[PDB]
Scaffold this active site. Structure first.
Site, PDB file in Angstrom:
ATOM      1  N   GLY D  10       5.831 -10.503  11.468  1.00 26.08           N
ATOM      2  CA  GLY D  10       6.985 -10.339  11.109  1.00 26.08           C
ATOM      3  C   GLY D  10       7.959  -9.126  11.665  1.00 26.08           C
ATOM      4  O   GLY D  10       7.669  -8.691  12.711  1.00 26.08           O
ATOM      5  N   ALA D  12       9.353  -7.073   8.736  1.00 21.20           N
ATOM      6  CA  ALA D  12       8.701  -6.333   7.132  1.00 21.20           C
ATOM      7  C   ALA D  12       7.216  -5.758   7.444  1.00 21.20           C
ATOM      8  O   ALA D  12       6.935  -4.768   7.154  1.00 21.20           O
ATOM      9  CB  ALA D  12       8.818  -7.107   6.170  1.00 21.20           C
ATOM     10  N   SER D 127       5.692 -11.904   4.584  1.00 22.47           N
ATOM     11  CA  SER D 127       6.616 -11.785   3.804  1.00 22.47           C
ATOM     12  C   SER D 127       7.002 -13.199   3.193  1.00 22.47           C
ATOM     13  O   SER D 127       7.258 -13.956   4.344  1.00 22.47           O
ATOM     14  CB  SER D 127       7.859 -11.273   4.169  1.00 22.47           C
ATOM     15  OG  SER D 127       8.473 -11.762   5.385  1.00 22.47           O
ATOM     16  N   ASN D 215       7.947   1.202   2.434  1.00 25.54           N
ATOM     17  CA  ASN D 215       6.783   0.989   3.271  1.00 25.54           C
ATOM     18  C   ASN D 215       5.812   2.006   2.920  1.00 25.54           C
ATOM     19  O   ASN D 215       4.523   1.612   2.907  1.00 25.54           O
ATOM     20  CB  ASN D 215       7.286   0.947   4.640  1.00 25.54           C
ATOM     21  CG  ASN D 215       8.226  -0.241   4.957  1.00 25.54           C
ATOM     22  OD1 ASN D 215       8.208  -1.191   4.376  1.00 25.54           O
ATOM     23  ND2 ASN D 215       9.011   0.202   5.973  1.00 25.54           N
ATOM     24  N   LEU D 239     -14.263  -5.338   0.098  1.00 24.01           N
ATOM     25  CA  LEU D 239     -13.307  -6.330   0.067  1.00 24.01           C
ATOM     26  C   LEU D 239     -13.713  -8.030  -0.103  1.00 24.01           C
ATOM     27  O   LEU D 239     -12.770  -8.657  -0.640  1.00 24.01           O
ATOM     28  CB  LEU D 239     -12.844  -6.507   1.805  1.00 24.01           C
ATOM     29  CG  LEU D 239     -12.251  -5.517   2.636  1.00 24.01           C
ATOM     30  CD1 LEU D 239     -11.485  -6.148   4.051  1.00 24.01           C
ATOM     31  CD2 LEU D 239     -10.935  -4.805   1.825  1.00 24.01           C
ATOM     32  N   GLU D 241     -15.690  -8.273  -2.859  1.00 29.03           N
ATOM     33  CA  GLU D 241     -15.831  -8.240  -4.196  1.00 29.03           C
ATOM     34  C   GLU D 241     -14.577  -8.624  -4.980  1.00 29.03           C
ATOM     35  O   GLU D 241     -14.386  -8.992  -6.203  1.00 29.03           O
ATOM     36  CB  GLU D 241     -16.301  -6.720  -4.626  1.00 29.03           C
ATOM     37  CG  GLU D 241     -17.521  -6.377  -4.389  1.00 29.03           C
ATOM     38  CD  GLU D 241     -17.852  -4.856  -4.633  1.00 29.03           C
ATOM     39  OE1 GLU D 241     -17.713  -4.562  -5.842  1.00 29.03           O
ATOM     40  OE2 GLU D 241     -18.150  -3.969  -3.844  1.00 29.03           O
TER      41      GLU D 241
END
Ligand SMILES: CC[C@H](/C=C(/C)[C@@H]1C[C@@H](OC)C[C@H](O)C(C)(C)[C@@]2(O)O[C@@H](C[C@@H](OC)[C@H](O)C(=O)O1)C[C@@H](OC)[C@H]2O)CO
Ligand SMILES: Nc1nc2c(ncn2[C@@H]2O[C@H](COP(=O)(O)OP(=O)(O)OP(=O)(O)O)[C@@H](O)[C@H]2O)c(=O)[nH]1
Ligand SMILES: Nc1nc2c(ncn2[C@@H]2O[C@H](COP(=O)(O)OP(=O)(O)OP(=O)(O)O)[C@@H](O)[C@H]2O)c(=O)[nH]1
Ligand SMILES: Nc1nc2c(ncn2[C@@H]2O[C@H](COP(=O)(O)OP(=O)(O)O)[C@@H](O)[C@H]2O)c(=O)[nH]1
Ligand SMILES: Nc1nc2c(ncn2[C@@H]2O[C@H](COP(=O)(O)OP(=O)(O)O)[C@@H](O)[C@H]2O)c(=O)[nH]1
Ligand SMILES: [Mg+2]
Ligand SMILES: [Mg+2]
EC number: 3.6.5.-
Lengths: 426, 424, 426, 424
Positions: D10, D12, D127, D215, D239, D241
């Site tokens: 994107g 964002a 987003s 950000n 990651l 878990e």
């Protein structure tokens, strides 16, 4: 054999206790780091009475230090001999007691007391043959009075066949140090009547009198007063810690000094007490020492002993002396002034002697008197208490902690009964 | 350890607080940039930060503090601000504007409590008569009571003088405060500006004073009260002890606060400044820090806080002497009417100040039936005002009701009756 | 004779293991490079129990290091003693276990387990007379719990007549470290009930209590907790590695500590544990050590031992001491407090003594208790598990790996049976 | 070794990614010209290259990246471009324009996977509400699911706020995304811009913020989440878990993400910043990074990621305290509702930034029934819009059908029902 466990509670109790531990330490040749630097084998022979030995010839007093606020004990630790105590034997709470017996006995103190009891048990388990407990506290505050009394109750319940003796600092007729003093004192005294074997009654006004009239001391510190008290305390247990011609004991003293179970409130004294100016002017004879001992001006309670009769008196002499002389002096006092001694107990004076005198003196003596004059203190307290209670003044602070009116009335009743009993023998 | 949290509310309170904090800093060697635990919370950079709550509805006094010398000392939160002041209006404090800020204050207090391992309680600084100090403070106190219950809530309060004032709605506000802090505050210590001025005129030999001097004087007293928490000494008094010793009945809890010796450099040398003399000065009618004669009233309970060089024997002697005097009347039911506190640490001199260095100083807190007269006077004033319904539209126009005033008056009457009873 | 093979599995298992290998190394005088720098011949005599000798007087621990993720073992290798391990004895996978017992036991772990078994076989072939295996893991995660259990199953199947003992870190009642902990723990425990000979139950909350209440340690690290655990571990095998008056053994301890085959969950303890401040204050007597040992505050499980009865306790003493004294102390404990010991097993306390004390101490002791109080842990776990399972909460993570509901029910049933058994002797 | 691949989709998402990459560079000492394996793929010239996928249908944001400071860092492929953006249209992302680029993206992902010896999975940044971030991302996720299956697919998502927005077709798009990422994404971590602004106003004492700050804040959180893969510490979280610990049922997988302490330089010195305090802050309603009150919802599962100086004992104590509080409500069926992760490596300060250096920081990921309310609100909005068939011609005109919307609504209703059930 004959181990004694010490408990010091509240501000005054801890302060007096610090001084006491200093004095005993110096007597036994123990330095603040727990090292022995004495010159005589007599110094170590019975060191176990007050001290416990650790690795590296370290000696640690069997002392339990108790307070609901940390300040006083922090000061004690900071002090000279403070590092000698076992760190685990400092037991403290966080909230103060506000000079409030109910907070010490029922609420704040109730939360802490189990922890203290555990430490006490631990210490008693290390005793080959535990003689008993010594407590130091004030009667007029919250912690020493309420918490202290509570502790006594607990320990007597658990160890009912051991000796329970207290050095109790009481309020003085002229100049009270707190407003609720009468309430606190009455509440404590009620419990002590039934749960202690002997109580040494100390009055700060009497100490000040001693300092000013006798010692000629312009500017006494609480430290100095404490010293005197410590000296008296040491006197009592001298015969457990050293040899002698007549080896006394706590239990022996109790046997000879308490003719009826509730009458166990003693007036302590110490001799010689002489001004630094007039030291060479005095001849240190046993007769003169005896005279000092029996002088009302050399007593540490708020009594006129001449306004009552002695039921029994115990004298403990320290140093070299003629037993003949001692006995003769005792006879002379009683024959000359038989009116001041109850007639139904022949030989009202008991004497003990310990060969080893305290530092810096050839002779000394400690006096313990059970006099009917003590009733005056109780009567005065009762009057004060009633003056407040009849108007329920300050009472909400106590009812708010769950106490009821009936307890106060019970306390009053006990007090009055005690007074009546004393008057009987007067 | 022993820890307490200060709360400073209003203009007057904030002013007092500044002085207090300065005094504290001088005592403990803390620099104005923060470079003790009892008052100063310590952080991980050799930095000491006050443990106080600073509240004002008008953003002026607080702004001054934020810009001035001790800006780095205080946290950027402890100093709390609003938008518009109450303007001598209890109703705008207690009901309307206070319930916008109060939550934040409560949160702050909670946070402070969390940071302590034995919170002794609270010291609050406000003013009977001011708009914020009356209503907002009351509101805060109620909330505190609801929350903590058995944490000490001590108040330091500027009582309105009889023959002088600075606001013509001061009777109302004060009365309201009295009504709504009678079942919450444990102690409310009293100082009066007229009395302070009189003292300055008499003892200090100074007749051009200002608020700063008064604040400093108040701060000295505060320090004396709190000296036992922060230093060693025989007879270490606690914040919890005051309640026990100065409050015979829960409604009766306004004791006067006086300090001796309040004296300049010139007659510090002339005077001996012994303990007994100081004690005597403490009980003298003119030296008292409010407009009341203690000859027209019996002392219920007194508390003495000796600071510096003091042989306890001397103190005892002084007390005995005081007792002997015919104022000096005590009540029938309180024979033991004295509490004694001693500290080795002497008083501390503030640069560019009124007072000189002394060996020994004394602070006396006394609860007496002399304040009854003052209360009666206040009541009379209120009656005079409220009979015509003067200013009532302001108070009623923001929350209050006709009837509340009556209730307050009734309460005051009851209090007076209680005092009378105590007198007998 | 008497070789022991060590397996360390998962994060906690490897971390504790590192510390253990450090401690053992220092005890045997082995430096991180595998060189011996000891002063006594006793140090090498039985070094073969834990170490294998290589060219150039190099000693290599018989340790197998297992994980499904490389991080922890990379850290271990980077560590101080990390270079002492055989590189070929690091066995690892690539994908993590996600705190998921099913991944450890059935899927990811199943792919790796054969490789581990091969290494194990290789090590066992080098043993003149292999005593058995020691495993270190957590019960609440995926690798130590699932993979670890799996390994145990495999090894018991292949070596059913050897000793299988585990040091198992369990969840703590207050503050869980993972959300699925109850599931993982129950799944592991089910397997351990049937496939291990003894399991030492370690609770991190108890360790923290020890650190704060006993050691007075303001800021304990996991390293410090690990140290304590390692000390306990070393205690157990002391009698294989050194001489003594009563030479214990793993098997002997099992014989005396497991009266019924399924009741093999022990509460470990260690003594002395004393604050660095209060070291000189303590006298290091066998009685005092005994008292420490039996104090609930000095236990390493999430139990109140006073809420149950001891079926058997094994004490292992290290240093010089009087057997007379030891025996007398043991008798005193049982006579005084017979209610805390099951009445159907006379002489509930077994004592062993090894002459060589651990570094820096003259005396030490390790305590191993089989108490019915352990049921509380199991009961609490069961309650938690049921709370989740009755709503099938988090269950899809396990069913997705091929597990069925029936397994969970079986596990629950086992748990409950165990609890019932414990309650019998309570 | 442990390796993961980032995907940024994107405008964002790309913005967030830039910040993240900057943070990473600051952490690992990598210069802007490339002069770790977890994120940076290393080549044979002492050069480190990010392992990310950067996708945008509009060639503007990507172009900016290509011209800016970190242009030499990124590969000339990882940064992928299109020709025209979706323009807030899920249909132009998911159906029309996305199926031109998606193949390339997939290929890139495959290539990246090939370069790894233990791919933990994916981190995706998009987003809810945007045209590309809604539809294209969904499409990508589906493809990933089809391909890899049991590789972790974590999402970082910008949830639309209740009382504020920047696009008047945002309900539709978000709903569509929810419908088509309910059977693919394992975790979808949530941040809300309004919440961040509120935080800035309150804690930081800053009331002139911009997207960059937001950000940066997001990047901090991301770093905290991923710190266990790149440094040593007790309790190294993976990651994989998160999925196990925060997803009790497969549809329920939206947990909120919050960070403490978010505080400026001025009141970093005032505060102690102890562990317990930080933990408390984490659970406070206002400090949360979305517009929801967790008082109106039971916590199913929480995950705490302590970073820096932390005694685990202290953490345990904090957790116990939290448990004690009445409020902080947990569900009946999850007693153990905590996961704890610790790292020795502290947080890293970005030059010209909002935040000061700290000893210790905490990131909390919490899955709760509080988000149900938000979902309901969104549904209501959708209903209000779709009742008149507003904007539908745009979506229907590029692929979609009348009926799909209804299906989506039904799905949402089902989700709500599930949440309600969980609440009981
Ligand atoms: C025999 C098995 C055993 C059971 C009991 C009851 C044992 C016996 C004794 O120890 C051997 C107690 C002991 O003699 C003491 C009194 C010195 C002491 O240690 O007791 C504890 C409390 C006690 O429980 C009440 C303790 O926790 C404990 O476990 O006690 C406080 C402690 O403060 C310093 C101290 O006061 C459980 O394994
Ligand atoms: N001693 C002293 N008294 C003060 C000071 N400031 C104000 N006062 C007194 O406090 C009363 C006025 O209350 P303030 O505190 O000024 O009012 P406030 O609390 O700010 O309330 P509002 O201004 O009405 O919102 C008067 O009796 C003043 O004489 C000060 O610094 N020192
Ligand atoms: N926090 C943050 N939010 C952003 C940023 N850029 C856009 N947003 C938010 O994202 C939403 C808009 O989606 P975008 O990502 O701009 O749209 P897109 O994905 O490029 O899709 P199209 O432009 O519609 O093709 C709004 O809610 C914005 O507030 C950013 O840099 N940071
Ligand atoms: N002799 C002596 N009396 C003290 C000492 N400290 C306090 N007191 C007296 O003890 C009484 C006050 O009680 P205190 O012990 O301080 O209160 P507590 O801490 O609540 O028990 C008063 O009568 C004081 O005069 C001291 O060190 N020595
Ligand atoms: N005592 C101790 N406990 C640990 C250590 N590391 C993790 N734990 C605990 O082990 C449990 C988590 O399991 P862990 O071993 O990290 O997961 P695994 O790698 O999947 O087996 C939690 O109860 C942690 O508190 C450690 O080094 N020492
Ligand atoms: Mg104002
Ligand atoms: Mg775009």
């Amino acid at each position: 054999m004959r181990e004694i466990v010490h408990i010091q509670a509240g501000q005054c109790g801890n302060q007096i206790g610090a001084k006491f531990w200093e004095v005993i330490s110096d007597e036994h040749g123990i330095d603040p780091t727990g090292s022995y630097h004495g010159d005589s084998d007599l110094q170590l022979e019975r060191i176990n009475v007050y001290y416990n030995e650790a690795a590296g010839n370290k000696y640690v007093p069997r002392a339990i230090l108790v307070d609901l606020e940390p300040g006083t004990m922090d000061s004690v630790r900071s002090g000279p001999f403070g590092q000698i105590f076992r760190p685990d034997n400092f037991v403290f709470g966080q909230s103060g007691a506000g000079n409030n017996w109910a907070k010490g006995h029922y609420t704040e103190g109730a939360e802490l007391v189990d922890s203290v009891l555990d430490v006490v048990r631990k210490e008693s388990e290390s005793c080959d043959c535990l003689q008993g407990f010594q407590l130091t506290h004030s009667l007029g505050g919250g912690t020493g009075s309420g918490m202290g009394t509570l502790l006594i109750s607990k320990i007597r319940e658990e160890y009912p066949d051991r000796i329970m003796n207290t050095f109790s600092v009481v309020p003085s007729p002229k100049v009270s140090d707190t407003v609720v003093e009468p309430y606190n004192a009455t509440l404590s005294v009620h419990q002590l009547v039934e749960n202690t074997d002997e109580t040494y009654c100390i009055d700060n006004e009497a100490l000040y009198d001693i300092c000013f009239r006798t010692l000629k001391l312009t500017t006494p510190t609480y430290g100095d007063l404490n010293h005197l008290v410590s000296a008296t305390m040491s006197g009592v247990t001298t015969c457990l810690r050293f040899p002698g011609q007549l080896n006394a004991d706590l239990r022996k003293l109790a046997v000879n000094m308490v003719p009826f179970p509730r009458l166990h409130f003693f007036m302590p004294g110490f001799a010689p007490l002489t001004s630094r100016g007039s030291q060479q002017y005095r001849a240190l004879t046993v007769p003169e020492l005896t005279q000092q001992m029996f002088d009302a001006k050399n007593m540490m309670a708020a009594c006129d002993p001449r306004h009552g009769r002695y039921l029994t008196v115990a004298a403990v002499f320290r140093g070299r002396m003629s037993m003949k002389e001692v006995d003769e002096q005792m006879l002379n006092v009683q024959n000359k002034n038989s009116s001041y001694f109850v007639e139904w107990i022949p030989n009202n004076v008991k004497t003990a002697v310990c060969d080893i005198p305290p530092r810096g003196l050839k002779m000394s003596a400690t006096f313990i008197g059970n006099s009917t004059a003590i009733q005056e203190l109780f009567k005065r307290i009762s009057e004060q208490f009633t003056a407040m209670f009849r108007r329920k003044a300050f009472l909400h602070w106590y009812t708010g902690e769950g106490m009821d009116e009936m307890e106060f009335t019970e306390a009053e009743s006990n007090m009055n009964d005690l007074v009546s009993e004393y008057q009987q023998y007067q | 350890m022993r820890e307490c949290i200060s709360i400073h509310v209003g203009q007057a309170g904030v002013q007092i607080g500044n002085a207090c904090w300065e005094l504290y800093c001088l005592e403990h060697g803390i620099q104005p940039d923060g470079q003790f635990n009892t008052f100063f919370s310590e952080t991980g950079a050799g930095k000491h930060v006050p443990r106080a709550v600073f509240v004002d509805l008008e953003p002026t006094v607080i702004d001054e503090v934020r810009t001035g010398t001790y800006r780095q000392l205080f946290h950027p939160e402890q100093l709390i601000t609003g938008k518009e002041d109450a303007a001598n209006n209890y109703a705008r404090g207690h009901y309307t504007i206070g319930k916008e800020i109060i939550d934040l204050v409560l949160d702050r207090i909670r946070k402070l409590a969390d940071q302590c391992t034995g919170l002794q309680g609270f010291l609050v600084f406000h003013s009977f008569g001011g708009g914020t100090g009356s209503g907002f403070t009351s509101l805060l106190m109620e909330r505190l009571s609801v929350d903590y219950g058995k944490k000490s809530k001590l108040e330091f309060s500027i009582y309105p003088a009889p023959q002088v004032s600075t606001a013509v709605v001061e009777p109302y506000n004060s009365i309201l405060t009295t009504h709504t802090t009678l079942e919450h505050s444990d102690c409310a210590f009293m100082v009066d500006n007229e009395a302070i001025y009189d003292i300055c005129r008499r003892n200090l030999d100074i007749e051009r004073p200002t608020y700063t001097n008064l604040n400093r004087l108040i701060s000295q007293i505060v320090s004396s009260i709190t000296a036992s928490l922060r230093f060693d000494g025989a007879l270490n008094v606690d914040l919890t002890e005051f309640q026990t010793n100065l409050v015979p009945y829960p409604r009766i809890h306004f004791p006067l606060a006086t300090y001796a010796p309040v004296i300049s450099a010139e007659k510090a040398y002339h005077e001996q400044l012994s303990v007994a003399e100081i004690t005597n000065a403490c009980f003298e009618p003119a030296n008292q820090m409010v407009k009341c004669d203690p000859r027209h009233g019996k002392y219920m309970a007194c508390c003495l806080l000796y600071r510096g060089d003091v042989v306890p024997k001397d103190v005892n002697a002084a007390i005995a002497t005081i007792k002997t005097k015919r104022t000096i009347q005590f009540v029938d039911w309180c024979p033991t009417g004295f509490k004694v506190g001693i500290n080795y640490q002497p008083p501390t001199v503030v640069p560019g100040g009124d007072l000189a260095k002394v060996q020994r100083a004394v602070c006396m807190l006394s609860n007496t039936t002399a304040i009854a007269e003052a209360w009666a006077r206040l009541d009379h004033k209120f009656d005079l005002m409220y009979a015509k319904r003067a200013f009532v539209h302001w108070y009623v126009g923001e929350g209050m009701e006709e009837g509340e005033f009556s209730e307050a008056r009734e309460d005051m009457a009851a209090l007076e009756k209680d005092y009378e009873e105590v007198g007998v």
